[PDB]
Write a protein that binds this ligand. Sequence first.
Ligand SMILES: O=C1Cc2cc(Nc3ncncc3Cl)ccc2N1
Ligand SMILES: O=C1Cc2cc(Nc3ncncc3Cl)ccc2N1
Ligand SMILES: [Cl-]
Ligand SMILES: [Cl-]
Lengths: 4, 4, 124, 124
Amino acid sequence: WVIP
Amino acid sequence: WVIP
Amino acid sequence: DSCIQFTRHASDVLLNLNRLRSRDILTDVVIVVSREQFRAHKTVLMACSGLFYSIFTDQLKCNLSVINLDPEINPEGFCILLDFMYTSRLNLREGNIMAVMATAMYLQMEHVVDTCRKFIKASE
Amino acid sequence: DSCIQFTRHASDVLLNLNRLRSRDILTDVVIVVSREQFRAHKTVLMACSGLFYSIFTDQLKCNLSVINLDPEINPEGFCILLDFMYTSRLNLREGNIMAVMATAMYLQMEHVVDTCRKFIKASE
Ligand SMILES: O=C1Cc2cc(Nc3ncncc3Cl)ccc2N1
Ligand SMILES: O=C1Cc2cc(Nc3ncncc3Cl)ccc2N1
Ligand SMILES: [Cl-]
Ligand SMILES: [Cl-]
């Protein structure tokens, strides 16, 4: 999971 | 395009 | 093999599937949640959820145009997960995390369940 | 928004759509090419091709279970492109590049047309  |  | 690969292909496909959903094009099922209705594509639901995969591979249920979810399922939690299925983006917030995790467990969306568990553990 | 994003989601969705195609699950159309038949999902074809997008948004054609392609279309070129649609991998070779480019132009798959043009230009 990432900060888009 | 890339070499997978 | 000796194939070449287009890096952005999968993302472009998903973006186009979401545009078809927005415009209600070729949607083939209605998911009913506590009298809230959500139109979708059976194949996308199956590709994202172990529960929809089991439902639409069943010889009788594969032909249903309406699926009713368990009454304990929260429509907002479902809406956030349906958006995730079509975009890869999860709108996870303090006010919805419990409903989102419970819905992801029921839908069998293991990666969503994992990040909810981690975000909850960080707040304790 | 304040969304989080699962990097591998789009690729995982496409991989699952390809597994459904392999097992012939929920395929809703047959594409006929020079008496060679290919089963697929209308939504995936539309997400990848400007030609299938136009065909399946047409009020009469959206309901067809069989689509016949132009007789000049090569079945191998189509097969390579259908595989690309479901995997992001293009099996481009000296022996098939002309058929692949001609099929991608007809199907309106602009990124495939682009790499074929570049690979042809490098060989001249
Ligand atoms: O967490 C998850 C996400 C998910 C998706 C599916 N889908 C499929 N699996 C295998 N072949 C085709 C399909 Cl469509 C099954 C189980 C789970 N569990
Ligand atoms: O090269 C290409 C690839 C491609 C895909 C599509 N598909 C869609 N476009 C917009 N909203 C939904 C969909 Cl399904 C249309 C044109 C082209 N041209
Ligand atoms: Cl997931
Ligand atoms: Cl393309």
